[PDB]
Design a binder for this molecule. Sequence first.
Ligand SMILES: Nc1ncnc2c1ncn2[C@@H]1O[C@H](COP(=O)(O)OP(=O)(O)NP(=O)(O)O)[C@@H](O)[C@H]1O
Ligand SMILES: [Mg+2]
Length: 353
Amino acid sequence: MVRIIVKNVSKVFKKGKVVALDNVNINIENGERFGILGPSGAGKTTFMRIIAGLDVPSTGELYFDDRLVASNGKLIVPPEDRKIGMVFQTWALYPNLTAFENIAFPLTNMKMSKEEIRKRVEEVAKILDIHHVLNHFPRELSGGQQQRVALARALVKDPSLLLLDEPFSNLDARMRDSARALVKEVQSRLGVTLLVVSHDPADIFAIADRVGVLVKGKLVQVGKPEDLYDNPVSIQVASLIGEINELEGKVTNEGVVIGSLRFPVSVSSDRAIIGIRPEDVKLSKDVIKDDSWILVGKGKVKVIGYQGGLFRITITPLDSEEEIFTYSDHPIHSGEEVLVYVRKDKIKVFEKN
Ligand SMILES: Nc1ncnc2c1ncn2[C@@H]1O[C@H](COP(=O)(O)OP(=O)(O)NP(=O)(O)O)[C@@H](O)[C@H]1O
Ligand SMILES: [Mg+2]
């Protein structure tokens, strides 16, 4: 319901010594599901707090629709006037308050009567399917129920924007799938603009329609998840969005050489970094007669693993320590020599310089 325009936003700490965010530019569309991915310390929470209005840009401006909300160290529209709901990385339900009281809390000074408060809480409780446990204390609720109460609390003032800072971190795995689905269902039910942050890529493919990657305070790439996956601007972005094999080779007239392997791509530097995802590699004991796979050379199996019902096969080129891993329904014993094939249009190459 609200468009977020981030114009040249920077944020410093330690009197300037630490640049948490450096000239960030992004336009998040109204009603969009937007994700931010980046390593620990990249500036995700700092970004979220600036959007929430809990902090301000040191330089630059922030607009909600055409409304200036912060500018160069000044808060123009305070958090309480921004129509935002948040579930922060270290969110906590008040242990001594029931679910009702936890959800009602944000309404205490909103000039609404007891009846108006009850009606609003029950309404959002129904949306989150926890209307039946409103009288329970948080310790009496399941993990899923707790997450629902936290969401209801963030949605009780009818916000236009919902901010989630690493929401599915306190989850095991079965719960994560469920929690991700819930976030999507309630974003649909209310139409809110949604910003979610994480150092975990699974949440991004699950929830986000567009994603921004933050590295050391810099927004290095923005695009649809599949765009970042297939066309990463760097090997670092490549690895953040998904598994990838990273190899360093010498640039040659014929291609990039890594031991006995030769990849048919080129850059400019004398050295190159090759990125190849596991699904874009295939191993074989004989030549593959398929124009969709390209032979890059011989390899030797180093070790095999077994996870997720699949075998993880790790090989190295002849005369190299560089590893390449892939997944297969069938195993190949260590020490066996194999032909290594790749999807050519899927080879990612970057300068080492
Ligand atoms: N109040 C503060 N004072 C000083 N430094 C800060 C403050 N808040 C954040 N930082 C620093 O700014 C950088 C970004 O912090 P932060 O935005 O919290 O990263 P993050 O991406 O959320 N990390 P993580 O949650 O572990 O994935 C780090 O170098 C922090 O140490
Ligand atoms: Mg954080």
